[PDB]
Amino acid sequence: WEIDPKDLTFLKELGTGQFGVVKYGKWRGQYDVAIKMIKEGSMSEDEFIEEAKVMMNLSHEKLVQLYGVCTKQRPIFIITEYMANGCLLNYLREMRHRFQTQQLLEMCKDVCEAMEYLESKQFLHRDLAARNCLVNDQGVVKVSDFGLSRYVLDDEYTSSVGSKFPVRWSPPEVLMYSKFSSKSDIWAFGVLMWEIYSLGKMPYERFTNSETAEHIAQGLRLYRPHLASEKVYTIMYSCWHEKADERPTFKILLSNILDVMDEN
Numbered sequence: 001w002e003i004d005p006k007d008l009t010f011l012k013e014l015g016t017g018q019f020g021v022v023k024y025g026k027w028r029g030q031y032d033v034a035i036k037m038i039k040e041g042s043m044s045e046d047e048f049i050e051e052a053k054v055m056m057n058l059s060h061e062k063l064v065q066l067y068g069v070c071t072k073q074r075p076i077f078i079i080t081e082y083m084a085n086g087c088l089l090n091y092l093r094e095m096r097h098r099f100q101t102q103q104l105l106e107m108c109k110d111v112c113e114a115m116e117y118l119e120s121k122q123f124l125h126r127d128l129a130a131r132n133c134l135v136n137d138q139g140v141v142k143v144s145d146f147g148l149s150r151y152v153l154d155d156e157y158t159s160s161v162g163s164k165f166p167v168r169w170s171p172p173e174v175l176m177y178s179k180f181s182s183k184s185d186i187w188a189f190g191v192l193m194w195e196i197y198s199l200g201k202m203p204y205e206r207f208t209n210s211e212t213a214e215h216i217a218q219g220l221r222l223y224r225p226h227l228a229s230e231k232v233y234t235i236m237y238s239c240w241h242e243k244a245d246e247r248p249t250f251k252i253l254l255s256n257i258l259d260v261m262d263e264n
């Protein structure tokens with residue numbers, strides 16, 4: 001839905017992302033929001049504006065909500081839910097020594113719930129990773145920027161040999177054929193579980209992107225992080241079946257994670 005830009009108050013810079021500058025502010029003085037100012041030439045704006053209603057209607061506690069847009073002016077604005085603790089990857093690394101294993105599992109559950117919801121709506125994230133999860137003031141993890149990778153205009157991001165392509169979160173059928181599906185979000189979720197349980201380590205560190213693609217194509221997988229139990233690793237490992245149809249759904253994954261919680 002179209003937000004009235006007069007209802008927005010810009011308060012602080014939040015840095016830069018794939019679409020340029022993002023600011024912290026408020027909507028009608030009360031609601032904290034992030035406001036993306038879409039760098040001209042960085043986004044396929046027709047495609048995005050054409051297909052944006054569906055994305056505004058995705059509503060779930062564990063999604064970083066898309067409140068609406070401003071399109072009557074340039075640059076266009078995307079206004080989203082504000083998350084005080086920022087992105088999950090930096091949160092993991094900064095709070096690395098505080099987490100108890102049950103909290104790690106709870107973060108995975110947060111994301112899995114969001115992804116079960118997207119799955120049920122046949123909506124793909126396409127770039128699930130700890131950097132594209134955000135954390136609010138109570139430590140709840142939410143999935144952010146789902147589906148926007150489809151509108152990126154940047155050859156370094158959209159080409160699987162580009163320097164910005166999420167190679168380390170991609171299954172073989174994406175790296176070889178660009179076959180995105182629910183099962184490629186599944187693969188990425190397993191890697192995200194690995195990010196959480198490794199407390200923010202980089203997957204395949206010291207491997208290049210091409211070396212990563214080569215070595216996952218040959219069946220090699222991320223090691224079990226120290227803080228992951230056998231059961232937890234079995235869950236993240238099931239996301240990495242070479243053949244996409246052997247990977248679980250997010251409904252099954254959620255059940256697996258709940259089962260682990262019951263047992264503890």
Ligand SMILES: Cn1nc(-c2cccc(NC(=O)c3ccc(C(C)(C)C)cc3)c2CO)cc(Nc2ccc(C(=O)N3CCOCC3)cn2)c1=O
Pocket residue numbers: 014015016017018019022034036064080081082083084085086087127132134144145146148149150152
């Ligand atoms: C919604 N939102 N968005 C951002 C934020 C800010 C800048 C850039 C971005 N990223 C993006 O816009 C973005 C991300 C991914 C994509 C693709 C297409 C999927 C690849 C496209 C655009 C984002 C995420 O959308 C930061 C938030 N929040 C914070 C909060 C605090 C801090 C922070 O500085 N700290 C330091 C002090 O304490 C910890 C938090 C940073 N970001 C926030 O709530």
